[PDB]
Amino acid sequence: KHNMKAFLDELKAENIKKFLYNFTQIPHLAGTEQNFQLAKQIQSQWKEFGLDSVELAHYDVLLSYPNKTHPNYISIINEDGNEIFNTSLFEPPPPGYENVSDIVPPFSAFSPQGMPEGDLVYVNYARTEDFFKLERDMKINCSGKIVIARYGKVFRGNKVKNAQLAGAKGVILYSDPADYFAPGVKSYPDGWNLPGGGVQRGNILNLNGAGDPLTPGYPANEYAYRRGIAEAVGLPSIPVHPIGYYDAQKLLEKMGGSAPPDSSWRGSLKVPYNVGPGFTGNFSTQKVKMHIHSTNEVTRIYNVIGTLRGAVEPDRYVILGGHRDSWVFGGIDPQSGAAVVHEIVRSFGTLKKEGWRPRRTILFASWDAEEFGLLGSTEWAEENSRLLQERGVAYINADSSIEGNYTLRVDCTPLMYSLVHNLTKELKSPDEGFEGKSLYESWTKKSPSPEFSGMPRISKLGSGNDFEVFFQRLGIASGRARYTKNWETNKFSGYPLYHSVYETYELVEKFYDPMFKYHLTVAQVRGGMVFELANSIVLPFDCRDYAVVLRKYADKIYSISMKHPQEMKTYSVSFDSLFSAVKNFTEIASKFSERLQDFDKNPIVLRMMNDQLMFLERAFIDPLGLPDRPFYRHVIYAPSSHNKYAGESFPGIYDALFDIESKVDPSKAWGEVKRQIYVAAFTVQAAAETLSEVA
Amino acid sequence: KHNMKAFLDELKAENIKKFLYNFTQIPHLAGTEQNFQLAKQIQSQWKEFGLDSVELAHYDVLLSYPNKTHPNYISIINEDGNEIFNTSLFEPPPPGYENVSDIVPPFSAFSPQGMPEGDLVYVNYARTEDFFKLERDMKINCSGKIVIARYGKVFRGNKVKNAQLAGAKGVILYSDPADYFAPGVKSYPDGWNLPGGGVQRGNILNLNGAGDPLTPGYPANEYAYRRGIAEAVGLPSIPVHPIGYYDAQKLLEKMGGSAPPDSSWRGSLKVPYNVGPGFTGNFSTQKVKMHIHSTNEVTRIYNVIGTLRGAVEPDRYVILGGHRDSWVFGGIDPQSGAAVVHEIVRSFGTLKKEGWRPRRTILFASWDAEEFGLLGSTEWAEENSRLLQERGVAYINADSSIEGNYTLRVDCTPLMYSLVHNLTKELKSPDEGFEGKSLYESWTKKSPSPEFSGMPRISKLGSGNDFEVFFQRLGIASGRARYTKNWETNKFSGYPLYHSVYETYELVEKFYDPMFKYHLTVAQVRGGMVFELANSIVLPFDCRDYAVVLRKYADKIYSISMKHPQEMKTYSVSFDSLFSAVKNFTEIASKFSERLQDFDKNPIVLRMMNDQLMFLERAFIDPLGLPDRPFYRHVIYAPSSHNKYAGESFPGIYDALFDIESKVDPSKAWGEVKRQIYVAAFTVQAAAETLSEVA
Numbered sequence A, B: 001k002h003n004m005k006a007f008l009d010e011l012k013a014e015n016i017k018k019f020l021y022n023f024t025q026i027p028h029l030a031g032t033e034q035n036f037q038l039a040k041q042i043q044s045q046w047k048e049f050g051l052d053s054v055e056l057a058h059y060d061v062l063l064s065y066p067n068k069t070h071p072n073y074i075s076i077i078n079e080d081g082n083e084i085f086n087t088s089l090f091e092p093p094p095p096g097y098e099n100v101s102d103i104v105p106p107f108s109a110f111s112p113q114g115m116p117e118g119d120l121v122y123v124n125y126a127r128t129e130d131f132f133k134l135e136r137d138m139k140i141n142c143s144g145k146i147v148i149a150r151y152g153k154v155f156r157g158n159k160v161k162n163a164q165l166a167g168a169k170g171v172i173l174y175s176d177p178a179d180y181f182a183p184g185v186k187s188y189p190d191g192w193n194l195p196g197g198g199v200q201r202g203n204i205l206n207l208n209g210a211g212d213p214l215t216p217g218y219p220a221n222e223y224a225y226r227r228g229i230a231e232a233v234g235l236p237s238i239p240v241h242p243i244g245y246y247d248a249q250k251l252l253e254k255m256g257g258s259a260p261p262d263s264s265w266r267g268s269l270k271v272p273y274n275v276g277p278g279f280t281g282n283f284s285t286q287k288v289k290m291h292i293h294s295t296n297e298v299t300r301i302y303n304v305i306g307t308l309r310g311a312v313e314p315d316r317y318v319i320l321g322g323h324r325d326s327w328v329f330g331g332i333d334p335q336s337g338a339a340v341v342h343e344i345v346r347s348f349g350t351l352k353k354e355g356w357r358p359r360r361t362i363l364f365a366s367w368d369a370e371e372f373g374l375l376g377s378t379e380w381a382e383e384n385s386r387l388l389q390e391r392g393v394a395y396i397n398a399d400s401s402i403e404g405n406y407t408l409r410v411d412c413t414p415l416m417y418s419l420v421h422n423l424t425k426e427l428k429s430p431d432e433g434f435e436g437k438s439l440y441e442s443w444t445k446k447s448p449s450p451e452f453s454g455m456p457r458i459s460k461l462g463s464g465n466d467f468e469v470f471f472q473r474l475g476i477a478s479g480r481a482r483y484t485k486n487w488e489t490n491k492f493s494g495y496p497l498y499h500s501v502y503e504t505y506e507l508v509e510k511f512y513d514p515m516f517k518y519h520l521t522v523a524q525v526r527g528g529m530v531f532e533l534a535n536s537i538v539l540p541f542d543c544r545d546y547a548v549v550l551r552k553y554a555d556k557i558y559s560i561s562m563k564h565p566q567e568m569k570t571y572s573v574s575f576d577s578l579f580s581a582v583k584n585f586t587e588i589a590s591k592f593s594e595r596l597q598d599f600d601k602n603p604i605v606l607r608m609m610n611d612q613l614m615f616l617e618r619a620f621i622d623p624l625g626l627p628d629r630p631f632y633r634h635v636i637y638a639p640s641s642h643n644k645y646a647g648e649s650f651p652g653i654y655d656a657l658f659d660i661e662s663k664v665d666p667s668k669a670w671g672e673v674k675r676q677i678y679v680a681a682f683t684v685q686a687a688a689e690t691l692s693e694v695a
């Protein structure tokens, strides 16, 4: 047979290993020649594997690179102006790579240039609440100061935005061992920990879904009209640079001023974690000085787009996409994912050569410039938005396949919950001690949902990856899956070697997945989802699962509001309309489910009902967007305004309620809460009504 | 057979006459009890005629009404402050209606309240170019003046916006006999001319597609959150009132200051048409004073929605809609249209009772509050936007069936040109001297297109009617058709009795269409279009007709730019990308047309190709809208920024070029021209690509 088992059995761990090795011997930084060569390689192989067409889609977008002859660094500078301590110019290269060229040194992509000099303030993780604590409780003023923040907890772009609004004139980011050195594990090369010379690269934009900073709304093609830099989207206004913990120790050890307010502010280095401003007594006239010379430059990027045309519904697209560009070697991020996509393409192409085609069209994507702001995925979606809006069934992401070795992680739309539960029940667990058991069984046992027992955890989609345009701009049902670490011990730092030179093929082969079994399990989950999406006669979405979570989110947002019972009385703030809409959605979805089971098993009734399923995620889009974030159009889910990686439910109401007890005009503030309640209730009801009988 | 002939032959002129009489005996002003009663009547009859469901859809929207105990009027006031002349409090009622209650007196809907007093300036038609002439050439300053303008040429809302931006503190609108008294024809009741006591009602909003001023984006349902008045969309900031030409003669006869600049400024009254400011010598200390006391009030409105479910594609909607609310009796506007819709429903329901159903679902609409800003149509579309976006095949409007008796008028999307030509070739002409000839033949002879010879004129859609939400917001293929007057003699004033108390059943029966034959012809055209749209196996749209007009519009906009050859050199302004896109659209549309003829006559290939046809109008929508007009989202067609009734092609580029030689920063101005060229070329190319093979 050519069925899902045939597809799944063709997948090989050894192939994934070979591809991973192949993709990780040299850097593949976005906009570089090496990453164009790899694009061409992938294009050629996907043709050989059997896809019907494989093309490159290119764009010219704003990228950022350090100046090779004028290095970035930070100093401590004395009264005379001598630089008495300098941070490192590069990470010590790992064993066997010390002769590799074109390793980009640590930098914060999109930093403006500058040489600010001043007194330090330590701001913990530079979260919204960290700045609240500093300003409101401790009375420390960051205006004109250089802030130093530890990586962790939230997206670094949010940190930089928060520092800027506090009046900082610069930001130093560092990796604390509290967050990036796991107990009892050795530093790379002898284990998977971050050494003291290691540094996490990454961009510091606040794009809010825009894509290329210069062309919001439209693809950065050959005739594009570009904004000037000063009107560009999401660029930081102060210089920023990242360092490792050996260097951070030297900048922190002399700090004076106030003590840390409590222990959640102290990391693991042998320093007091004083907040400042400035250094203690003897050193009070010393200062910190940054030297940032990076440049932003419009640069060509290349996506690879592969098509396997559907036999029955070629105008229905199921997309498997993940990025190809890396900061350095990309041993985990993204090549552990890219190798899994490569093997999935190979397995689908094996079936194709034996005469099979899926029911619907499958598109495969190797995106560029993910690391610079989801640029490649977003420009392509901008170009193809009309096709995607009207024909997009589902997007499955495929970045890193592993960030740990403990259990499965899935984040997806409620529409895919049933599909994931069913598929995982049919796959074998790779976990020690669950031999001969299902993946569902191990997953549920190691990662219990915080709601249902006998069920596994499935998280909301947040952002910080290439599904953002598809899900939160365009409203296409999306999901992602990988192997992850223990949620119990998850400090929301990411894995220690994230975006460092130490993220290599050897890291993976020696410490994460020697047998490539977790990779194979993730290939089965991603590939299995694509298979079912592209081949099931009825789309495998259960609208009743959305009804259940909408009730949970409505309870949650109501609970937040109810912290302010006096204002809800004064301003007549009711959630009754939202609850009504959720009740109606629940009722209508139940009836639709009955019809979908009882209908005359009539292709037009079938195509009608498949369109109702396909357009249900679509219905949650508001064409006006969310307030001041036009490209976040989904009403139920947006990236958190405080942390791009985290998803927020009923974001418009959430942000209207946030810190509302501090607004100077409560009438206006509670008016906007009511406004957002109306928008949400309306959108829920409208989405429900797409599932009613059509006439 | 149950075919189009069966449908068409069932239509009766005598029925249209009976319905017209029935709908025009009492006023049906929006928001009044009488118009709710008529809604209920229509609902009951459409059920009896055989539709599957007929429901009322209600909204609470901002309406405007004079104060019954505090009448609006204008005075000339002397040095002491005595009102020596007052305009009329009402139009003399026509014969036999002098005892009818609830005739709303002449007023400008949405005027703010006020009693401004000042000197008059006469501003011709209050067009953009009229104000240019006044300010730039004549050096006359309108600041703090009351302006008096003749109706005609452009939508009255544009007049009021233009007066406000010139600094006026009030506006008086009047009907000049030059524009509303046809040579050799008697005043009502003895002919179809405007008497001197007649006055044209109408709203003066600038909504730019928003619908209800208080709820832009969302339906004005029971839980809607409403903007405060000061944040409302499109309300005028100065008082405004309309008068007839007996009264206007008394306000104009004393005008002094400058002479009219040329004869295009002089109407037909026996006055000099001096521009002012103020009155001549003896009267120089006299002033004009307005007294406006109308109020804006949220009021319930009622749309009637009827459904005739499709047998094969019930999830595909072909909509026939027109409004039911009238200023007074609505003998022409809208009841000549509403009666035609009523008879179309009756004929379709006759076929249904004999067991027939159309292929696709037909929706019939009786909209409310059209006269107050397309409110009823727009609120319903806001509510149902997701269903309409994904399922809307076509919208056919059905306001007034007649505005003359000379020939057919059609304004529609290029996608319907072929459909209209073909249908009209099969219908009989009602025209004297074309007995036994086709409607196509008479139409083409009396209204030659200004492009093709052997072809009839078909105009672009403008606005000022209920198709606006469907076409320019949502991108659903739309059209309209009526009988009209001679284009040779068309001064763009509208018919003389427009929005007056004299627009009665008798006007129509005695002077426009005694035999109801023009009404029957328009019922055949509107109903025939609906029939073909809802029943043709392949949708009856020809994408090649869009290609031809896109080239014409690109030539036109390029020609406008080329008035500025030096700036196009300085700023490197090229239309090459637009021309390229139009060429590609032409090529791709040609191939698609081949496939549509050659395809395997396979329902999925059929539903795929019908979806490509349905979503082609959709593809011209930009979700970001046009500059400062978020609800005008179609890139090819928008209502003119200078005249809501007129359509503009490539509006974003047009407005970027308009009066550009007067902008103070030409670099910036020409930058935005280039930006709009990019947006247009991109949208044309993207629309083309929806017609490529799908995979």
Ligand SMILES: *[C@@H]1O[C@H](CO)[C@@H](O[C@@H]2O[C@H](CO)[C@@H](O[C@@H]3O[C@H](CO[C@H]4O[C@H](CO)[C@@H](O)[C@H](O)[C@@H]4O)[C@@H](O)[C@H](O[C@H]4O[C@H](CO)[C@@H](O)[C@H](O)[C@@H]4O)[C@@H]3O)[C@H](O)[C@H]2NC(C)=O)[C@H](O)[C@H]1NC(C)=O
Binding pocket: A577, A578, A580, A581, A584, A681, A682, A685, B055, B056, B057, B058, B222
């Ligand atoms: C969840 O789904 C339910 C349906 O099961 C929706 O229920 C509707 O709720 C609205 C708001 O409460 C009801 O609105 C009321 O409609 C009355 C007239 O309804 C009749 O006529 C209409 C046609 O115009 C028919 O469609 C309808 O079926 C009924 O035959 C009005 O008279 C009411 O207004 C009066 O009371 C209100 C409230 O006190 C006053 O403010 C007004 O001034 C006025 O006095 C009112 O507008 C509606 O009838 C219900 N529909 C149905 C089919 O039952 C919920 O709305 C939905 N939830 C959400 C969030 O959409």
Ligand SMILES: *[C@@H]1O[C@H](CO)[C@@H](O[C@@H]2O[C@H](CO)[C@@H](O[C@@H]3O[C@H](CO[C@H]4O[C@H](CO)[C@@H](O)[C@H](O)[C@@H]4O)[C@@H](O)[C@H](O[C@H]4O[C@H](CO)[C@@H](O)[C@H](O)[C@@H]4O)[C@@H]3O)[C@H](O)[C@H]2NC(C)=O)[C@H](O)[C@H]1NC(C)=O
Binding pocket: A055, A056, A057, A058, A222, B577, B578, B580, B581, B584, B681, B682, B685
């Ligand atoms: C009307 O439809 C036609 C197609 O028939 C479109 O033609 C495209 O036009 C663009 C812009 O001119 C061409 O862009 C050029 O692409 C070159 C690479 O193309 C090859 O590789 C790509 C994959 O990346 C393939 O898809 C493609 O088929 C080719 O194999 C680039 O090298 C060019 O850039 C170089 O020259 C330019 C111009 O001087 C410089 O600015 C650059 O710096 C660089 O040196 C260029 O980007 C494209 O190849 C054409 N496509 C095809 C299929 O022929 C029109 O674009 C379309 N009109 C509109 C408005 O969309």
Ligand SMILES: *[C@@H]1O[C@H](CO)[C@@H](O[C@@H]2O[C@H](CO)[C@@H](O[C@@H]3O[C@H](CO)[C@@H](O)[C@H](O)[C@@H]3O)[C@H](O)[C@H]2NC(C)=O)[C@H](O)[C@H]1NC(C)=O
Binding pocket: A418, A419, A422, A539, A540, A541, A542, A597, A598
């Ligand atoms: C995940 O798998 C579950 C369990 O197999 C699937 O649910 C099952 O779906 C089938 C097929 O529609 C249901 O069968 C139907 O039962 C009704 C009940 O009367 C009958 O009338 C129909 O003709 C048909 O036989 C079955 O009831 C249902 N089981 C449960 C517990 O819900 C589910 O659909 C899968 N999900 C996805 C997305 O595929």
Ligand SMILES: *[C@@H]1O[C@H](CO)[C@@H](O[C@@H]2O[C@H](CO)[C@@H](O[C@@H]3O[C@H](CO)[C@@H](O)[C@H](O)[C@@H]3O)[C@H](O)[C@H]2NC(C)=O)[C@H](O)[C@H]1NC(C)=O
Binding pocket: B418, B419, B422, B539, B540, B541, B542, B597, B598
């Ligand atoms: C308006 O009517 C015209 C004239 O009837 C319709 O155009 C005609 O459409 C038919 C049906 O598709 C075409 O027939 C086809 O001809 C090709 C030519 O080789 C053949 O391969 C097909 O199998 C089929 O027989 C016909 O050529 C065409 N005539 C012309 C002059 O274009 C037109 O489609 C009608 N428009 C609408 C919207 O209905």
Ligand SMILES: *[C@@H]1O[C@H](CO)[C@@H](O[C@@H]2O[C@H](CO)[C@@H](O)[C@H](O)[C@H]2NC(C)=O)[C@H](O)[C@H]1NC(C)=O
Binding pocket: A021, A022, A025, A040, A041, A044, A045
């Ligand atoms: C990654 O694998 C590819 C494909 O096997 C290798 O590229 C091929 O290299 C051979 C030998 O130089 C050439 O003959 C082929 O033309 C290449 N094929 C393609 C499609 O590019 C590549 O060398 C491998 N890279 C590494 C570092 O092992």
Ligand SMILES: *[C@@H]1O[C@H](CO)[C@@H](O[C@@H]2O[C@H](CO)[C@@H](O)[C@H](O)[C@H]2NC(C)=O)[C@H](O)[C@H]1NC(C)=O
Binding pocket: A075, A081, A082, A083, A084, A085, A086
């Ligand atoms: C930190 O790096 C800086 C810059 O390279 C060093 O300062 C320079 O020292 C050279 C050689 O002594 C002088 O000629 C330059 O004028 C100095 N430049 C600046 C900007 O100060 C500094 O010595 C280094 N500090 C340490 C501790 O290594």
Ligand SMILES: *[C@@H]1O[C@H](CO)[C@@H](O[C@@H]2O[C@H](CO)[C@@H](O)[C@H](O)[C@H]2NC(C)=O)[C@H](O)[C@H]1NC(C)=O
Binding pocket: A192, A404, A405, A485, A489, A511, A512
């Ligand atoms: C791979 O899995 C092993 C086994 O679970 C992990 O090692 C254990 O880590 C936990 C701490 O979380 C300790 O409780 C155990 O004592 C460790 N056992 C051994 C044998 O080392 C290891 O951490 C995993 N690798 C990665 C990269 O996460």
Ligand SMILES: *[C@@H]1O[C@H](CO)[C@@H](O[C@@H]2O[C@H](CO)[C@@H](O)[C@H](O)[C@H]2NC(C)=O)[C@H](O)[C@H]1NC(C)=O
Binding pocket: B021, B022, B025, B040, B041, B044, B045
């Ligand atoms: C317009 O026509 C309608 C329908 O024929 C008339 O309304 C009917 O009036 C009769 C007599 O009063 C009643 O028995 C029916 O219940 C009414 N039907 C409906 C559906 O409303 C109406 O009277 C006519 N109006 C005028 C001015 O002639």
Ligand SMILES: *[C@@H]1O[C@H](CO)[C@@H](O[C@@H]2O[C@H](CO)[C@@H](O)[C@H](O)[C@H]2NC(C)=O)[C@H](O)[C@H]1NC(C)=O
Binding pocket: B075, B081, B082, B083, B084, B085, B086
């Ligand atoms: C125009 O109408 C106004 C207002 O009704 C008339 O002025 C009023 O005249 C009455 C009776 O003489 C006075 O008691 C009021 O005080 C006046 N009101 C105002 C606002 O002036 C005026 O007479 C009318 N003019 C003409 C020519 O008929």
Ligand SMILES: *[C@@H]1O[C@H](CO)[C@@H](O[C@@H]2O[C@H](CO)[C@@H](O)[C@H](O)[C@H]2NC(C)=O)[C@H](O)[C@H]1NC(C)=O
Binding pocket: B192, B404, B405, B485, B489, B511, B512
């Ligand atoms: C109905 O049609 C008649 C006949 O065309 C119109 O009357 C003619 O109007 C034109 C002026 O446009 C004159 O050239 C003719 O001399 C008129 N003839 C007659 C017999 O009156 C009439 O104007 C039309 N009615 C309406 C409302 O437009």
Ligand SMILES: *[C@@H]1O[C@H](CO)[C@@H](O)[C@H](O)[C@H]1NC(C)=O
Binding pocket: A067, A068, A069, A070, A295
């Ligand atoms: C890099 O720095 C050098 C010298 O320090 C300078 O001359 C050059 O212009 C800079 N390059 C860029 C791209 O900014």
Ligand SMILES: *[C@@H]1O[C@H](CO)[C@@H](O)[C@H](O)[C@H]1NC(C)=O
Binding pocket: A141, A142, A143, A144
């Ligand atoms: C913070 O410091 C800056 C530095 O001059 C000052 O301008 C600003 O007002 C200060 N804010 C507070 C709350 O002290």
Ligand SMILES: *[C@@H]1O[C@H](CO)[C@@H](O)[C@H](O)[C@H]1NC(C)=O
Binding pocket: B067, B068, B069, B070, B295
């Ligand atoms: C209408 O005018 C009267 C008296 O001239 C005033 O008392 C009343 O409030 C006004 N009505 C409205 C609705 O404004």
Ligand SMILES: *[C@@H]1O[C@H](CO)[C@@H](O)[C@H](O)[C@H]1NC(C)=O
Binding pocket: B141, B142, B143, B144
């Ligand atoms: C028009 O008149 C007003 C009235 O005071 C004045 O403020 C404005 O500047 C004048 N503009 C010109 C161009 O004279």
Ligand SMILES: [Ca+2]
Binding pocket: A210, A211, A212, A214, A215, A216, A217, A218, A219, A220, A378, A379, A382
């Ligand atoms: Ca872009």
Ligand SMILES: [Ca+2]
Binding pocket: B210, B211, B212, B214, B215, B216, B217, B218, B219, B220, B378, B379, B382
């Ligand atoms: Ca609204």
